[PDB]
Design a protein around this ligand. Structure first.
Ligand SMILES: Nc1nc2c(ncn2[C@H]2C[C@H](O)[C@@H](COP(=O)(O)OP(=O)(O)OP(=O)(O)O)O2)c(=O)[nH]1
Length: 639
DNA sequence: TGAGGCATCCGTAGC
DNA sequence: GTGCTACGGATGCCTCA
């Protein structure tokens, strides 16, 4: 079976291992974390858990042999020289081509850099990203799930360890009451052989170029982002919280003085029984007596002031109960930079290809919205995200990215001609719908126009479009058919995509990633329409995500070949004025960068150029770089 | 037969 | 019957005293 070889305590064996490791061009290094249940002797401490330590590594390069490097203090080779050799063997020198294979690459990168002090810089392979690339809408892979599906022969090796069931590497988890050496070696072996199998399957499926050109470098950029962390104030959040609490108290007092009956706003039954039947306000067509949602109250805001007040109350509460407490609970002092930041946890296992943050979900911070205090106070929570002192947020978003991708994929000559020239379409359709002049639109009206346009692109209509359109169904359908007649490319693209998905069973992104939609053949009109809508949405959203990833990796390369300094806020922990192009957040269309006010004039170019040359499309890509002292007040930048 | 803990769904937000 | 995601709170359902 396994042939674990301890490289420590032997000198000739250590030198042989070093030379063979340097000769080999494909590693399978894996970490090994253990408990302190019996410091500075057994290993290196880990940030976030003081009860766990890192002991050693398991390196495999073929067969069932898993060499075990030891970082333990436990004498010809001391800790310093072993660390020196370990760092030297993990760096690219003289076009040395290597392919490191790590399970859960981001976590291992962070653990090695922050604790041990080693930043591996080579070509990475993760036997959990390729599995997603194969089937994008499966469960999050586990070591047991990978071994069962791709390396069944070594399946009996995974016996006695129940930690493989969870979504975490075998060596990193501190449970199972096993020695870290054995878990690390077994992991190493499995993630090498199964990764060989995955590479074979990827080459068969023609997805290896995407895997090694745009996916793993994107994971590296995400690791840098998670090391950086978005800044925080804790001085503006309290101000907004106090203002919102005062407004909530005012709303409650006004409701009490108006109706005179206890409400319990969170209780839908009480609201229905005191609003739909008590205080007039007849309900719509459809305990559980009447529906109380945003749409039903929006349809009768003007009839009575009370529904508007309760909608305002619910909207304000769904900013302190869901956006204020999560941020205030999750903060870090970050002594080096002298400010409180917040470090999210990314996830790239989404169905389309987008990246979502899950602790907290920073991509859902509420926008700016006015308020009345018996003039608007601008209580937006985005005002509390600030850069390091002497820094500026340098956001850079594509303008109409999905629309441009759709124009490129549809070959609509008229739409391409419209988009290539400098003009606007969403504002124009908003003004035409609201009869105001074309050069006049509100921000909420802009958002509503975006919703309407993307809905009619994705195939909605009939009664659904009417509620947001505020118009009858007949003229709405007339407008829909007229637009379909003057957007021939869009309808032809929809028909072609549906037919191709019917023929093949999968829709292919512009880069090559494909998603499987069996529901196309569901024989049920509702589910068939849902699957067609999924295909049409995916073929564009995945393309947008891939273009954003290409832009991210290109920007990272361009600002890493320049600006000689630490690559991230986590790299300076391994020890100078802060100067660089740090990457802090991605909003599915934007790349927030935390730039000091000395490289901005350069970075605002390097970003704006590199986002424009990411993919050669028929329609030119537009980038709107905006600079500001905070995520709330972002003013446009000339260049 | 009543009560407490857990699995599930809903309505909100962003893109 | 617009799609992707996260998530705190409401609402049963199952189980135990
Ligand atoms: N508002 C809205 N956006 C959607 C919808 N479906 C997809 N999106 C996608 C389209 C784009 O890829 C992305 C929008 O990203 P942004 O809001 O950052 O675009 P941006 O504001 O920079 O430009 P824009 O206002 O759209 O002209 O979200 C939808 O139903 N509503």
């Amino acid at each position: 079976s396994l042939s674990i070889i301890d490289v420590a305590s032997d000198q000739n064996l250590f030198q042989t291992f070093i030379k063979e490791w340097r000769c080999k061009k494909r590693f399978s290094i894996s970490l090994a974390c253990e408990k302190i249940r019996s410091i500075r002797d057994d290993g290196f401490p880990i940030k976030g858990c003081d009860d766990t330590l890192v002991v050693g590594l398991a390196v495999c390069w073929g067969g069932r042999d898993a060499y075990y490097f030891s970082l333990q203090k436990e004498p010809s080779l001391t800790l310093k020289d072993r660390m020196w050799y370990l760092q030297s063997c993990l760096r690219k020198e003289s076009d040395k081509e290597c392919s490191v294979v790590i399970y859960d690459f981001i976590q291992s990168y962070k653990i090695l850099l922050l604790s041990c002090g080693i930043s591996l810089e080579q070509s990475y392979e993760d036997p959990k990203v390729a599995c997603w690339l194969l089937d994008p809408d499966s469960q999050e892979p586990t070591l047991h799930s990978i071994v069962t599906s791709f390396l069944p022969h070594e399946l009996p090796l995974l016996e006695g360890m129940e930690t493989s069931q969870g979504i975490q590497s075998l060596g990193l988890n501190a449970g199972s009451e096993h020695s870290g050496r054995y878990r690390a070696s077994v992991e190493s072996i499995l993630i090498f052989n199964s990764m060989n199998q995955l590479n074979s399957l990827l080459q068969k499926e023609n997805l290896q170029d995407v895997f090694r050109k745009v996916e793993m470098p994107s994971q590296y950029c995400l690791a840098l982002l998670e090391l950086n962390g978005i800044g925080f104030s804790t001085a503006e959040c309290e101000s907004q919280k106090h203002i919102m609490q005062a407004k909530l108290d005012a709303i409650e007092t006004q409701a009490y003085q108006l109706a005179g009956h206890s409400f319990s706003f969170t209780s839908s039954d009480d609201i229905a029984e005191v609003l739909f039947l008590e205080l007039k306000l007849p309900p719509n067509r459809e305990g559980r007596q009447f529906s109380t949602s945003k749409d039903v109250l929006n349809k009768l805001k003007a009839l009575h002031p009370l529904p508007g007040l309760i909608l305002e109350w619910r909207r304000i509460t769904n900013a302190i109960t869901k956006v204020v407490f999560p941020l205030q609970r999750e903060k870090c002092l970050n002594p080096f930079l002298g400010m409180e930041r917040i470090y999210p946890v990314s996830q790239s296992h989404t169905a389309t290809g987008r990246i979502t943050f899950t602790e907290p979900n920073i991509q859902n911070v509420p926008r700016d919205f006015e308020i009345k205090m018996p003039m608007p106070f601008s209580i937006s929570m985005r005002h509390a995200f600030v850069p390091f002192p002497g820094g500026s947020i340098l956001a850079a978003d594509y303008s109409q990215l999905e629309l441009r991708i759709l124009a490129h994929l549809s070959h609509d000559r008229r739409l391409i001609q419209v988009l290539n020239t400098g003009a606007d379409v969403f504002r124009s359709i908003a003004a035409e719908w609201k009869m105001i002049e074309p050069e006049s639109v509100g921000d909420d009206l802009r958002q509503q126009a975006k919703q309407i346009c993307y809905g009619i692109i994705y195939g909605m209509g009939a009664k659904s479009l009417g509620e947001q359109m505020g118009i009858k169904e007949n003229d709405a359908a007339c407008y829909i058919d007229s637009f379909k007649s003057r957007y021939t490319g869009i309808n032809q693209f929809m028909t072609e995509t549906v037919k191709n998905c019917k023929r093949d069973g999968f829709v292919q992104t512009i880069l090559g990633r494909r998603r499987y939609l069996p529901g196309i053949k569901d024989n049920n009109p509702y589910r068939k329409a849902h699957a067609e809508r999924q295909a049409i949405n995916t073929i564009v959203q995945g393309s947008a995500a891939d273009i954003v990833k290409i832009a991210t990796v290109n920007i990272q390369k361009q600002l890493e070949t320049f600006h000689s300094t630490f690559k991230s806020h986590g790299h300076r922990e391994g020890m100078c004025p802060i100067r660089g192009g740090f990457f802090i957040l991605q909003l599915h269309d934007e790349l927030l960068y935390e730039v000091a006010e000395e490289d901005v004039v350069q970075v605002a170019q390097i970003v704006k150029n590199e986002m424009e040359s990411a993919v050669k499309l028929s329609v030119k890509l537009k980038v709107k770089v905006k600079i500001g002292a905070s995520w709330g007040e972002l003013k446009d930048f000339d260049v």
